[PDB]
Amino acid sequence: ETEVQWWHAMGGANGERVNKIAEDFNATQSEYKVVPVYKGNYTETMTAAIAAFRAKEHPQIVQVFEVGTATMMAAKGAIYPVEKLMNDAGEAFDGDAFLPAVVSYYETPEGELLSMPFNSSTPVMWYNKTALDAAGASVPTTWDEVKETAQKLVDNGMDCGVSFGWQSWVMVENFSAWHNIGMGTKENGFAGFDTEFSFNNEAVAARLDGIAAMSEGNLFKYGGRRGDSLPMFTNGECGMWMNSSAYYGSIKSQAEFEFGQTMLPLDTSVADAPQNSIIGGATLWVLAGHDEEEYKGTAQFLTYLSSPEVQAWWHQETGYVPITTAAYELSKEQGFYESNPGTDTAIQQLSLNTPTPNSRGLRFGNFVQVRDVINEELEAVWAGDKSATDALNAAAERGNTLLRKFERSAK
Ligand SMILES: O=P(O)(O)OC[C@H](O)CO
């Protein structure tokens, strides 16, 4: 058998599902063996795959988070564009089948998808319904309601009211799209490499300052980057938790309480109605430099991932959105949204209203490094070391240096 190495960043429950998908494909035919290899968080996984390319130890497939897309698109010669791979191997590829938001987010300026969609998400407001009920609180729709609900929870003895993971993705990137404000110039990077950051504005700053002020009295508690704060929610310590829809699998298995999810809170001091939320998660890039049989097996595995049944199973088990309309329709016909209330929140929120350039998503080179900058500066806010105005100004300044570095090399 010819092995197809797939380096990915799926840990915990979702990682076990990756291994089930690969092995199911391996059991259906006798020519190709997909070998999934966990390489760490998204940054570690992308870094590892790129570093391996010199020693020719790089995988056939690498999962690269949405953040890394501009960098991967500029890495011409390192990637095998998926449409060319599929045609070369004799496998179908129909980009139009993917959700419109996925297509608009990932397509090149000429309308081509270079990578294979797989795990797309958006942030939702997770909540402990048991704790809300005991506190006499309601599911919030606005930021004022988030604070009031947090107060009721803590008054009723909850350790803390609200927290969030992936804080830049949630409280800067998605917060901006949800309120139709720009994240950077040149249409959040889609219109040019000469972009600069625009999130250092009064709307974002005032919200971050408001959250920091909730630390007193434990209405808010910071619980770290990425998914580090997950056990705060599943242990029943915080009653509200904003993070990826893709925590559904972990939450369903680890939470001893009744849980729900709803759309992100609206900051009514910024807007009277929400816009839409934006993509998170990753896509699958095929790397150059391998042989024909390795690519044939890669293409056949991508076909296995393209089926509505596999896409629906992945969505149902993880909380990543159904990546195609067909997978959504299959899940609906199976009664999944009736039997599991709220699992259609993420797909609805991505397409809530006709998008604007501010709500398409983001495309910034070196955004892997900018993500660290933004997390560092937000941590300075939670620690009381900087105001949000100063922290965001520093994040935009440091981020702009990274954008200029990318622009200089992308020519
Ligand atoms: O937890 P995920 O896979 O939905 O990813 C969250 C963010 O989009 C990562 O940048």
Short mmCIF file of C-alpha atoms and ligand atoms in Angstrom, two decimals:
data_model
loop_
_atom_site.label_atom_id
_atom_site.label_comp_id
_atom_site.label_asym_id
_atom_site.label_seq_id
_atom_site.Cartn_x
_atom_site.Cartn_y
_atom_site.Cartn_z
CA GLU A 1 0.00 0.00 0.00
CA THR A 2 0.91 3.60 -0.72
CA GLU A 3 0.77 5.79 2.38
CA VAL A 4 -0.82 9.24 2.44
CA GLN A 5 0.47 11.28 5.38
CA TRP A 6 -2.02 13.80 6.76
CA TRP A 7 -0.65 16.23 9.34
CA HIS A 8 -3.37 17.90 11.35
CA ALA A 9 -4.09 19.89 14.50
CA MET A 10 -7.26 18.13 15.70
CA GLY A 11 -6.89 17.18 19.35
CA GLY A 12 -9.22 15.77 21.97
CA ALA A 13 -12.55 14.38 20.83
CA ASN A 14 -12.33 15.83 17.31
CA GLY A 15 -8.94 14.18 16.82
CA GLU A 16 -10.40 10.79 17.56
CA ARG A 17 -12.93 11.50 14.85
CA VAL A 18 -10.13 12.32 12.38
CA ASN A 19 -8.62 8.91 13.08
CA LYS A 20 -12.01 7.23 12.55
CA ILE A 21 -12.45 8.98 9.18
CA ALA A 22 -8.98 7.99 7.95
CA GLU A 23 -9.43 4.37 9.05
CA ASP A 24 -12.89 4.12 7.48
CA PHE A 25 -11.37 5.20 4.16
CA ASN A 26 -8.51 2.73 4.68
CA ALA A 27 -11.02 -0.09 5.18
CA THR A 28 -12.96 0.68 1.95
CA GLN A 29 -10.12 -0.10 -0.49
CA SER A 30 -6.79 -1.91 -0.50
CA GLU A 31 -4.43 0.46 -2.38
CA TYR A 32 -3.98 3.56 -0.17
CA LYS A 33 -3.43 4.00 3.57
CA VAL A 34 -4.07 7.43 5.07
CA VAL A 35 -1.91 8.03 8.14
CA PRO A 36 -3.13 10.97 10.24
CA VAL A 37 -0.42 12.52 12.39
CA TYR A 38 -1.21 15.05 15.12
CA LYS A 39 1.36 17.86 15.01
CA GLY A 40 0.13 20.15 17.80
CA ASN A 41 -2.00 23.26 17.73
CA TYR A 42 -2.73 24.99 14.43
CA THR A 43 0.41 27.11 14.55
CA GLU A 44 2.65 24.16 15.45
CA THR A 45 1.09 22.02 12.70
CA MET A 46 1.51 24.63 9.98
CA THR A 47 5.06 25.40 11.16
CA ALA A 48 5.99 21.71 11.18
CA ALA A 49 4.72 21.04 7.68
CA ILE A 50 6.51 24.06 6.19
CA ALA A 51 9.74 23.22 8.04
CA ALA A 52 9.64 19.62 6.78
CA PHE A 53 9.55 20.72 3.12
CA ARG A 54 13.31 21.32 2.98
CA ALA A 55 14.26 17.84 4.26
CA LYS A 56 11.58 16.32 1.96
CA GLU A 57 9.92 14.88 5.07
CA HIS A 58 6.71 16.86 4.51
CA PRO A 59 3.26 15.23 4.35
CA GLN A 60 0.93 14.85 1.39
CA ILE A 61 -1.83 16.78 3.21
CA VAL A 62 -1.56 19.44 5.90
CA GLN A 63 -4.43 21.04 7.79
CA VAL A 64 -3.79 24.82 7.85
CA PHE A 65 -6.04 27.11 9.86
CA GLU A 66 -7.94 29.97 8.25
CA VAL A 67 -5.32 32.38 9.67
CA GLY A 68 -2.60 30.85 7.49
CA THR A 69 -4.44 31.11 4.17
CA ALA A 70 -2.75 34.20 2.72
CA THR A 71 0.66 32.75 3.57
CA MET A 72 -0.21 29.43 1.90
CA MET A 73 -1.57 31.19 -1.18
CA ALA A 74 1.73 33.06 -1.53
CA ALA A 75 3.68 29.77 -1.22
CA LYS A 76 3.51 28.99 -4.91
CA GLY A 77 5.71 26.01 -5.66
CA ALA A 78 5.06 24.47 -2.24
CA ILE A 79 1.45 23.49 -2.94
CA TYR A 80 -0.37 21.31 -5.46
CA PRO A 81 -3.62 23.20 -6.20
CA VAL A 82 -6.52 20.90 -5.32
CA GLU A 83 -8.43 21.45 -8.58
CA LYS A 84 -5.38 20.37 -10.57
CA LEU A 85 -4.72 17.39 -8.28
CA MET A 86 -8.28 16.14 -8.63
CA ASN A 87 -8.34 16.53 -12.42
CA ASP A 88 -4.91 14.87 -12.73
CA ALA A 89 -6.07 11.88 -10.67
CA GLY A 90 -9.52 11.56 -12.28
CA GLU A 91 -11.54 12.68 -9.26
CA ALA A 92 -14.39 15.18 -9.31
CA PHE A 93 -14.11 18.64 -7.80
CA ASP A 94 -17.09 21.02 -7.65
CA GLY A 95 -16.21 24.12 -5.66
CA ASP A 96 -19.75 25.49 -6.04
CA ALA A 97 -21.05 22.72 -3.77
CA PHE A 98 -19.39 24.28 -0.71
CA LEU A 99 -21.24 26.87 1.35
CA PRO A 100 -21.08 30.32 -0.29
CA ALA A 101 -19.30 31.77 2.76
CA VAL A 102 -16.63 29.05 2.49
CA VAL A 103 -16.16 29.69 -1.24
CA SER A 104 -15.95 33.49 -0.86
CA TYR A 105 -13.51 33.14 2.05
CA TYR A 106 -11.06 30.74 0.41
CA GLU A 107 -11.23 31.36 -3.35
CA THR A 108 -8.34 33.11 -5.07
CA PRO A 109 -9.08 36.44 -6.81
CA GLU A 110 -9.67 34.35 -9.96
CA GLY A 111 -12.30 32.10 -8.36
CA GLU A 112 -10.17 28.98 -7.75
CA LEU A 113 -10.11 26.96 -4.53
CA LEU A 114 -6.49 25.90 -3.92
CA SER A 115 -7.22 23.84 -0.80
CA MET A 116 -9.92 21.35 0.19
CA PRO A 117 -12.58 22.59 2.63
CA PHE A 118 -13.06 20.27 5.61
CA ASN A 119 -13.51 21.87 9.05
CA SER A 120 -15.08 25.34 8.97
CA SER A 121 -16.56 26.93 12.06
CA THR A 122 -17.79 30.18 13.52
CA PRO A 123 -17.94 31.26 17.17
CA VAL A 124 -21.15 30.82 19.15
CA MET A 125 -22.30 31.72 22.67
CA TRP A 126 -22.33 28.47 24.66
CA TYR A 127 -24.33 28.50 27.87
CA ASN A 128 -25.06 26.34 30.91
CA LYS A 129 -28.87 26.22 30.81
CA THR A 130 -29.01 24.48 34.19
CA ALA A 131 -27.04 27.30 35.81
CA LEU A 132 -29.04 30.02 34.04
CA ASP A 133 -32.30 28.48 35.25
CA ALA A 134 -31.06 28.24 38.84
CA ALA A 135 -29.98 31.90 38.73
CA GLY A 136 -33.31 33.04 37.27
CA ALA A 137 -31.42 34.31 34.22
CA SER A 138 -32.28 34.23 30.52
CA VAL A 139 -30.20 33.40 27.45
CA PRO A 140 -28.60 36.70 26.37
CA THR A 141 -28.85 38.37 22.97
CA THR A 142 -27.01 41.63 23.76
CA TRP A 143 -23.83 42.58 25.58
CA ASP A 144 -25.88 44.35 28.27
CA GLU A 145 -27.70 41.06 28.78
CA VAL A 146 -24.38 39.18 28.95
CA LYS A 147 -23.27 41.38 31.85
CA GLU A 148 -26.64 41.14 33.62
CA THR A 149 -26.73 37.35 33.22
CA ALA A 150 -23.15 37.10 34.47
CA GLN A 151 -24.15 39.11 37.53
CA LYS A 152 -27.07 36.78 38.25
CA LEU A 153 -24.88 33.69 37.85
CA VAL A 154 -22.19 34.92 40.22
CA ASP A 155 -24.80 36.18 42.71
CA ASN A 156 -26.12 32.59 42.70
CA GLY A 157 -22.65 31.21 43.51
CA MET A 158 -21.22 30.45 40.05
CA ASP A 159 -17.44 30.77 40.05
CA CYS A 160 -17.66 33.17 37.11
CA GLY A 161 -20.13 34.50 34.59
CA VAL A 162 -18.56 34.57 31.12
CA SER A 163 -15.31 33.73 29.38
CA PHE A 164 -14.17 33.01 25.83
CA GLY A 165 -11.55 31.10 23.90
CA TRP A 166 -9.70 32.01 20.70
CA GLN A 167 -10.01 35.60 21.89
CA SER A 168 -8.71 37.36 18.78
CA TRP A 169 -10.98 35.27 16.57
CA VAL A 170 -13.95 35.83 18.90
CA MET A 171 -13.57 39.32 20.35
CA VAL A 172 -11.69 41.14 17.55
CA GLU A 173 -12.17 39.38 14.21
CA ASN A 174 -15.71 38.08 14.66
CA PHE A 175 -16.73 41.01 16.85
CA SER A 176 -15.79 43.34 13.98
CA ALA A 177 -17.62 41.36 11.28
CA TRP A 178 -20.70 40.93 13.50
CA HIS A 179 -20.94 44.73 13.85
CA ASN A 180 -19.95 45.51 10.23
CA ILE A 181 -16.68 47.26 11.09
CA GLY A 182 -13.42 46.72 9.27
CA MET A 183 -10.54 44.62 10.54
CA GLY A 184 -8.07 46.08 8.04
CA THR A 185 -7.94 48.28 4.98
CA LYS A 186 -8.17 46.91 1.44
CA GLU A 187 -11.34 44.98 2.39
CA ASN A 188 -9.72 43.07 5.27
CA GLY A 189 -6.79 42.18 3.01
CA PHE A 190 -8.82 40.74 0.15
CA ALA A 191 -8.12 43.76 -2.07
CA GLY A 192 -4.36 44.04 -1.69
CA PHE A 193 -1.14 43.38 0.17
CA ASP A 194 -0.90 47.11 1.00
CA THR A 195 -3.41 46.59 3.82
CA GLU A 196 -3.06 47.94 7.36
CA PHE A 197 -5.01 47.12 10.50
CA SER A 198 -8.15 49.02 11.52
CA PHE A 199 -9.36 47.12 14.59
CA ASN A 200 -7.76 49.71 16.89
CA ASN A 201 -10.98 51.73 17.11
CA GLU A 202 -13.33 52.96 19.82
CA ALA A 203 -15.96 50.28 19.22
CA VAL A 204 -13.59 47.36 19.79
CA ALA A 205 -11.72 49.15 22.57
CA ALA A 206 -14.84 50.06 24.55
CA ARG A 207 -16.03 46.45 24.52
CA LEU A 208 -12.68 45.06 25.65
CA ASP A 209 -12.53 47.66 28.41
CA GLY A 210 -16.04 46.67 29.46
CA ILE A 211 -15.06 43.01 29.66
CA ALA A 212 -11.92 43.84 31.65
CA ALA A 213 -14.05 45.79 34.13
CA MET A 214 -16.12 42.63 34.64
CA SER A 215 -13.09 40.88 36.18
CA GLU A 216 -13.97 42.54 39.48
CA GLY A 217 -16.64 40.40 41.03
CA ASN A 218 -15.66 37.52 38.71
CA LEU A 219 -18.30 38.33 36.08
CA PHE A 220 -15.51 37.67 33.56
CA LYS A 221 -12.47 35.44 34.04
CA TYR A 222 -9.75 35.06 31.44
CA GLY A 223 -8.84 31.41 30.96
CA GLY A 224 -6.06 31.49 28.40
CA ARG A 225 -5.62 31.24 24.67
CA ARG A 226 -7.20 28.89 22.09
CA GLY A 227 -9.31 26.24 23.85
CA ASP A 228 -7.49 26.42 27.21
CA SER A 229 -10.69 27.71 28.86
CA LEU A 230 -12.83 24.73 27.69
CA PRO A 231 -12.83 23.01 31.13
CA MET A 232 -14.00 26.25 32.77
CA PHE A 233 -17.21 25.72 30.80
CA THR A 234 -17.51 21.92 30.94
CA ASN A 235 -16.69 21.82 34.67
CA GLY A 236 -19.55 24.24 35.38
CA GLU A 237 -17.31 27.12 36.50
CA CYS A 238 -18.44 29.73 33.95
CA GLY A 239 -22.05 29.93 32.82
CA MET A 240 -21.44 31.50 29.42
CA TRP A 241 -18.60 30.73 27.04
CA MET A 242 -17.97 32.12 23.56
CA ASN A 243 -15.90 29.89 21.31
CA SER A 244 -16.00 27.80 18.16
CA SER A 245 -19.07 25.84 17.18
CA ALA A 246 -16.56 22.97 16.92
CA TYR A 247 -16.49 22.50 20.70
CA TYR A 248 -19.88 20.72 20.42
CA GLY A 249 -18.38 17.22 20.49
CA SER A 250 -16.25 17.94 23.54
CA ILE A 251 -19.06 19.76 25.35
CA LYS A 252 -21.63 17.02 24.65
CA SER A 253 -19.30 14.45 26.16
CA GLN A 254 -17.91 16.37 29.12
CA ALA A 255 -20.65 18.66 30.41
CA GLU A 256 -22.77 17.21 33.24
CA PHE A 257 -25.37 19.96 32.84
CA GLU A 258 -27.91 20.93 30.20
CA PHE A 259 -26.13 23.11 27.65
CA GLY A 260 -27.12 25.22 24.69
CA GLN A 261 -25.69 27.52 22.07
CA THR A 262 -26.98 30.79 20.65
CA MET A 263 -25.78 33.53 18.35
CA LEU A 264 -23.05 35.94 19.43
CA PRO A 265 -24.18 38.85 21.61
CA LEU A 266 -24.93 42.14 19.89
CA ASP A 267 -23.18 45.25 21.21
CA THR A 268 -26.15 47.61 21.05
CA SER A 269 -23.83 50.58 21.66
CA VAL A 270 -22.25 49.78 18.27
CA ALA A 271 -25.12 48.53 16.09
CA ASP A 272 -28.88 48.03 16.23
CA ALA A 273 -28.68 44.66 14.43
CA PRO A 274 -25.93 42.13 13.65
CA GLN A 275 -24.31 41.61 10.25
CA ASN A 276 -22.91 38.06 10.02
CA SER A 277 -20.09 36.05 11.57
CA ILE A 278 -17.02 34.71 9.79
CA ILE A 279 -15.10 31.52 9.12
CA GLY A 280 -12.78 29.79 11.51
CA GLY A 281 -11.22 26.34 11.49
CA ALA A 282 -9.00 25.18 8.64
CA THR A 283 -8.74 23.73 5.14
CA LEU A 284 -6.58 20.92 3.76
CA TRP A 285 -3.59 21.83 1.57
CA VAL A 286 -1.84 19.31 -0.67
CA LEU A 287 1.92 19.75 -0.73
CA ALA A 288 4.15 19.57 -3.80
CA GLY A 289 7.10 17.25 -4.25
CA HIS A 290 5.51 13.79 -4.01
CA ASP A 291 4.94 10.99 -6.50
CA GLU A 292 1.98 10.08 -8.70
CA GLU A 293 0.68 7.21 -6.56
CA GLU A 294 0.91 9.32 -3.41
CA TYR A 295 -1.14 12.00 -5.17
CA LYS A 296 -3.62 9.42 -6.51
CA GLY A 297 -4.27 8.18 -2.97
CA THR A 298 -4.45 11.77 -1.72
CA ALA A 299 -7.07 12.57 -4.35
CA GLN A 300 -9.10 9.45 -3.56
CA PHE A 301 -9.08 10.36 0.13
CA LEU A 302 -10.26 13.87 -0.72
CA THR A 303 -13.11 12.29 -2.68
CA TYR A 304 -14.01 10.25 0.40
CA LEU A 305 -14.09 13.52 2.37
CA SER A 306 -16.29 15.11 -0.34
CA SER A 307 -19.29 12.94 0.18
CA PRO A 308 -22.37 14.48 1.84
CA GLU A 309 -22.54 11.55 4.25
CA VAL A 310 -18.97 12.01 5.52
CA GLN A 311 -19.38 15.79 5.65
CA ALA A 312 -22.64 15.46 7.60
CA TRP A 313 -21.13 12.95 10.03
CA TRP A 314 -18.14 15.23 10.64
CA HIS A 315 -20.44 18.22 11.27
CA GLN A 316 -22.75 16.26 13.58
CA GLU A 317 -19.94 14.77 15.66
CA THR A 318 -17.80 17.91 16.01
CA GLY A 319 -19.79 21.11 15.56
CA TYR A 320 -17.89 22.24 12.49
CA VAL A 321 -20.53 23.48 10.04
CA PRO A 322 -21.81 21.22 7.25
CA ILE A 323 -19.23 22.14 4.64
CA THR A 324 -21.68 21.78 1.73
CA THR A 325 -25.34 22.62 1.34
CA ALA A 326 -25.93 18.92 0.61
CA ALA A 327 -24.48 17.93 3.98
CA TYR A 328 -26.74 20.47 5.69
CA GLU A 329 -29.81 19.14 3.88
CA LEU A 330 -28.85 15.56 4.74
CA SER A 331 -28.47 16.44 8.42
CA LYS A 332 -31.83 18.22 8.40
CA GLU A 333 -33.61 15.28 6.73
CA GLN A 334 -32.02 12.99 9.33
CA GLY A 335 -33.72 15.11 12.01
CA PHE A 336 -30.39 16.21 13.49
CA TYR A 337 -31.46 19.82 14.11
CA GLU A 338 -34.68 18.60 15.71
CA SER A 339 -32.96 16.03 17.94
CA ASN A 340 -30.04 18.33 18.85
CA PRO A 341 -31.44 21.84 19.25
CA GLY A 342 -29.10 24.66 18.30
CA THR A 343 -26.66 22.74 16.08
CA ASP A 344 -27.78 24.90 13.14
CA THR A 345 -26.73 28.12 14.92
CA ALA A 346 -23.30 28.34 13.27
CA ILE A 347 -24.39 27.82 9.66
CA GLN A 348 -27.22 30.35 10.15
CA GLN A 349 -24.90 32.92 11.72
CA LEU A 350 -22.36 32.77 8.88
CA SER A 351 -25.07 33.68 6.36
CA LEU A 352 -27.37 35.79 8.55
CA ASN A 353 -27.40 38.73 6.11
CA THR A 354 -25.95 39.54 2.71
CA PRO A 355 -22.25 40.17 3.42
CA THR A 356 -20.20 43.35 3.04
CA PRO A 357 -16.41 43.56 2.63
CA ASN A 358 -16.25 43.90 6.43
CA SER A 359 -18.09 40.59 6.92
CA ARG A 360 -16.46 38.41 4.23
CA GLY A 361 -13.63 37.24 6.50
CA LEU A 362 -9.96 38.17 6.57
CA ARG A 363 -6.93 37.52 4.36
CA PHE A 364 -3.67 38.79 5.87
CA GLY A 365 -0.16 37.53 5.27
CA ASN A 366 1.80 36.72 8.43
CA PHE A 367 -1.46 36.58 10.37
CA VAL A 368 -0.10 33.59 12.32
CA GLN A 369 2.31 36.04 13.95
CA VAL A 370 -0.31 38.79 14.24
CA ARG A 371 -2.50 36.37 16.20
CA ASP A 372 0.22 36.13 18.84
CA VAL A 373 0.55 39.93 18.91
CA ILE A 374 -3.19 40.39 19.45
CA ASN A 375 -3.36 37.72 22.15
CA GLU A 376 -0.41 39.29 23.98
CA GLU A 377 -2.00 42.74 23.93
CA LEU A 378 -5.40 41.46 25.02
CA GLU A 379 -3.70 39.66 27.91
CA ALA A 380 -2.25 43.02 28.94
CA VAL A 381 -5.82 44.35 29.09
CA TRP A 382 -7.05 41.49 31.28
CA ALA A 383 -4.05 41.91 33.59
CA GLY A 384 -4.86 45.61 34.02
CA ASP A 385 -1.49 46.62 32.56
CA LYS A 386 -2.87 48.49 29.51
CA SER A 387 -6.15 50.09 28.54
CA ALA A 388 -7.83 48.52 25.52
CA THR A 389 -7.18 51.69 23.51
CA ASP A 390 -3.43 51.43 24.10
CA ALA A 391 -3.32 47.63 23.74
CA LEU A 392 -5.14 47.71 20.40
CA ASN A 393 -2.99 50.56 19.13
CA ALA A 394 0.09 48.52 20.00
CA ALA A 395 -1.40 45.42 18.36
CA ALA A 396 -2.19 47.35 15.17
CA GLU A 397 1.29 48.89 15.09
CA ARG A 398 3.10 45.59 15.66
CA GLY A 399 0.72 43.84 13.26
CA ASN A 400 1.38 46.43 10.57
CA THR A 401 5.10 45.72 10.77
CA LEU A 402 4.27 42.07 10.01
CA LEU A 403 1.98 43.07 7.13
CA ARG A 404 4.79 45.16 5.61
CA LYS A 405 7.23 42.27 5.99
CA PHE A 406 4.78 40.06 4.11
CA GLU A 407 4.25 42.66 1.39
CA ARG A 408 8.00 43.04 0.84
CA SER A 409 8.47 39.28 0.38
CA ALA A 410 5.30 38.70 -1.66
CA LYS A 411 6.90 40.39 -4.70
O1 LIG B 1 -11.55 25.70 16.89
P1 LIG B 1 -11.61 25.93 15.39
O2 LIG B 1 -11.04 24.70 14.63
O3 LIG B 1 -13.07 26.24 15.00
O4 LIG B 1 -10.60 27.19 15.04
C1 LIG B 1 -10.81 28.42 15.72
C2 LIG B 1 -10.06 29.52 14.97
O5 LIG B 1 -10.71 29.73 13.74
C3 LIG B 1 -8.60 29.14 14.73
O6 LIG B 1 -7.90 30.24 14.18
#
